[PDB]
């Protein structure tokens, strides 16, 4: 028996045992998320301990077979995923210190309650209070107070922990035969062994930078329009030539500009599209919503869902008798069990997110034939891109008219298309510069080529030039403003939101080209297109077996991130912006001084 045959046998035994234990762990987690008790917490703890203890032993018995003696590619990928040392390279004391640091950071971010104003009796929490007062606020002083109060009390707590967390993560990454933790993270968009379809962990940086350079003019036009619209509401608070203050971007950290729509809608007289009224008047429930979504998927060509999905998914909150978190998530519990957990209201947003999680489920069933370690997207943006394709398609007025929520009396015009494209750009384009900024900063920090005594200095100077958001007040080095973000504090990769944004529009362009759709791309409908369904399914069924380069080419025809689908998607909006903001300055000055 050769080393590769030994690897095959080991990987098969693994796949089986891992599938069993993963089903047990996922079922325990689903029981908890549908029923928050103490017995359910204990069940998750036991199942997760068993799963992690199995994964450690299987990794330490996978280290035996070297990769250099393996000629197969699927076996190579499975053993590469299984042999990952992870945090085991660190000593016991260092590993426990890192775990304690991560837990303390997560608890500080989650339980953070700030109480500067008046007596500490009045304090707000993340979800209802701080988000409610940051999303919809017209008070510059109040917004500044909230932003600087959260950035001061919290960041000062994370920074002493964050520096040592960075040191420990960099040490672990170096011990893992990498260059830094940034390289460890970039090792996900890496292909080695395939000729013609290969990727490098620095090639990702080059590609991301080139794509952002391509996207930049559209972002500058959108930024100028946003500043011009914000000026009318906010007098004497934003300069005509300078950048945009960070605390007035709707979100807590300015990740999304979606909430900045009431102050930026061009055609206020023209009503926006919304089908909530007709949806609730036509006696529509969660069952009907999901039945319509599965009808759309069947019309596209994808297979229907199991009868167990309907009887096991919890689509509505079961009242206050039992408490259950209803964050919309699609569950792939393993052995043929697909469930969706969400609190479905009769709303356009809930309909769209039902389509999104249903696309996630379709992706999960597509690669159900792949081995356990290859049951994932080609990279970490493919799943969200696949879901967002169907979210984009199901929101079109043509599809709404076809299904029945939109009356035929309604007409489509350039004003409506501009409103829809502006909302889409605020949601989608406005997050790409921020994501690229954050991941560039984190990569530079982990690489260590920059010094440590100017973390916030470099963070702010990169905010000025990349995203165009300025510091409302000066910040010293005791702050840790990047750590205030959930992904930064909880040790999460953030380039996935950059990559998925390009991938989803590439997929939409390819599928609409294969659906013989004529006209603008934003008015497309993948529905009733078995050709588009088959083309998407070809990439869907691959999973992680084929390299993401080949998976992208199998459905699109390109080999990397392309900005052209995004640009020709937003071409009508871009042309309208160019026509409209010609009398106002475009861009941000570098000479601004508070």
């Amino acid at each position: 028996s050769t080393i590769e045959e030994q690897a095959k046998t080991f990987l098969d035994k693994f796949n089986h045992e891992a599938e069993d234990l993963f089903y047990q762990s996922s079922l325990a987690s689903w029981n908890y998320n549908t029923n928050i008790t103490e017995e359910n917490v204990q069940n998750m703890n036991n199942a997760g301990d068993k799963w992690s203890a199995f994964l450690k032993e299987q990794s330490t018995l996978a280290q035996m077979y070297p990769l250099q003696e393996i000629q197969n590619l699927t076996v190579k990928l499975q053993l590469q995923a299984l042999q990952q040392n992870g945090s085991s390279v660190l000593s016991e004391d260092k590993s426990k210190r890192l775990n304690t640091i991560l837990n303390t950071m997560s608890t500080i971010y989650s339980t953070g309650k700030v109480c500067n104003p008046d007596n500490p009796q009045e304090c707000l929490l993340l979800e209802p209070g701080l988000n409610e007062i940051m999303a919809n606020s017209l008070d510059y002083n109040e917004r500044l107070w909230a932003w600087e109060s959260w950035r001061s009390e919290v960041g000062k707590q994370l920074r002493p922990l964050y520096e040592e967390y960075v040191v420990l993560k960099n040490e672990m990454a170096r011990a893992n035969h990498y260059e830094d933790y940034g390289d460890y993270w970039r090792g996900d968009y890496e292909v080695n062994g395939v000729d013609g379809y290969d990727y490098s962990r620095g090639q990702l940086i080059e590609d991301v930078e080139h794509t952002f350079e391509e996207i930049k003019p559209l972002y500058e036009h959108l930024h100028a329009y946003v500043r011009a619209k914000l000026m009318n509401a906010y007098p004497s608070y934003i300069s005509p030539i300078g950048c945009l203050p960070a605390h007035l971007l709707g979100d807590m950290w300015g990740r999304f500009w979606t909430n900045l729509y009431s102050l930026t809608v061009p055609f206020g007289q023209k009503p926006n599209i919304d089908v909530t009224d007709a949806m609730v008047d036509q006696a529509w429930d969660a069952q009907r919503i999901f039945k319509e979504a599965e009808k759309f998927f069947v019309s596209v060509g994808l297979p229907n869902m199991t009868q167990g999905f309907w009887e096991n998914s919890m689509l509505t909150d079961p009242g206050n008798v039992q408490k259950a978190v209803c964050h919309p998530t699609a569950w792939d519990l393993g052995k043929g069990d697909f469930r969706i957990l969400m609190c479905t209201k009769v709303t356009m947003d809930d309909f769209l997110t039902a389509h999104h999680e249903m696309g996630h489920i379709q992706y999960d069933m597509a690669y159900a034939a792949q081995p356990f370690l290859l049951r994932n997207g080609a990279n970490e943006g493919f799943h969200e891109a696949v879901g967002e394709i169907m979210s984009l398609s199901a929101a079109t007025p043509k599809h709404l008219k076809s299904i029945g929520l939109l009356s035929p009396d309604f007409q489509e015009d350039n004003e409506t298309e501009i409103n829809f494209l502006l909302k889409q750009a605020l949601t989608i384009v406005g997050t790409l510069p921020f994501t690229y900024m954050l991941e560039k900063w984190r990569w530079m920090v982990f690489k260590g080529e920059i010094p440590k005594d100017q973390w916030m200095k470099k963070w702010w100077e990169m905010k000025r030039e990349i995203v165009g958001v300025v510091e409302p007040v000066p910040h010293d080095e005791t702050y840790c403003d990047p750590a205030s973000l959930f992904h930064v504090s909880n040790d999460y990769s953030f380039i996935r939101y950059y990559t998925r944004t390009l991938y989803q529009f590439q997929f939409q362009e390819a599928l609409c080209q294969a659906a013989k759709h004529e006209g603008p791309l934003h008015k497309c409908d993948i529905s009733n297109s078995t050709e588009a369904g088959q083309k998407l399914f070809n990439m869907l069924r691959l999973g992680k077996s084929e390299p993401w380069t080949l998976a992208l080419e199998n459905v699109v025809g390109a080999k990397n991130m392309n900005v052209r689908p995004l640009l020709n998607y937003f071409e009508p909006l871009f042309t309208w912006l160019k026509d409209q903001n010609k009398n106002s300055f475009v861009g941000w000055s570098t000479d601004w001084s508070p």
């Binding site: 045959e5 030994q6 080991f10 069993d20 089903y23 167990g308 069990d337």
Partner: protein, 196 residues
């Protein structure tokens, strides 16, 4: 005389696929209509014999192999198939004049705690042959180093379990499969169909 056609289909427990149960049926009236009592039959393939002309021929013996597999492994119970059931657990010949009957048993079998009593074999030195049974549980060494007993780094005990929870998908649910194989040896046939 009516031999246990009902007892094979209506049995409290069904054997594992790796060690399946074979019953030799002889000296009978045919009474194939007892088989058709069960409505939810997931598969009624009838390779080599008409599914309506069974009650006209005579065979020396009839074998009713009964076992439990997954839903996506039912397709491997057919002449010429390949997988893990068709070459390590239960292979049936290329000719195979007979019928394959399978129906879902997610209620009788399966258990929320995990029904690990139903096992299958996933490792063998050589592929199985038509109608062969491998009950031995000797550990299948992966390569280049004898285990001299117990399992280890590249040892690997061969039998693998199903688990069969009731929340599994349709292709991962238990399926009681009863395979009828008619034997036509050049001997006085003992099983015949009724006729006036």
């Amino acid at each position: 005389n009516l031999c246990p056609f009902h007892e094979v289909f209506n049995a409290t427990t069904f054997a594992s696929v790796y060690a399946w149960n074979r019953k030799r049926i002889s000296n009978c009236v045919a009474d194939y209509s007892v088989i058709y009592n069960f409505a939810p039959f997931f598969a009624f393939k009838c390779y080599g014999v008409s599914p309506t002309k069974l009650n006209d021929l005579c065979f020396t013996n009839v074998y009713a192999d009964s076992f439990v597999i997954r839903g996506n492994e039912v397709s491997q119970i057919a002449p010429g198939q390949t997988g893990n059931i068709a070459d390590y657990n239960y292979k049936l010949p290329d000719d195979f004049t007979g019928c394959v009957i399978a129906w879902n048993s997610n209620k009788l079998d399966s258990k929320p705690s995990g029904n690990y009593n139903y096992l299958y074999r996933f490792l063998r030195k050589s592929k199985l042959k038509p109608f062969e049974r491998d009950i031995s549980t000797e550990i299948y060494q992966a390569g280049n180093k004898p285990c001299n007993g117990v399992a280890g780094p590249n040892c690997y005990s061969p039998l693998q379990s199903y688990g069969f929870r009731p929340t599994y998908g349709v292709g991962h649910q238990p399926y009681r499969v009863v395979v009828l194989s008619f034997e036509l040896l050049h001997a006085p046939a003992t099983v015949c169909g009724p006729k006036k």
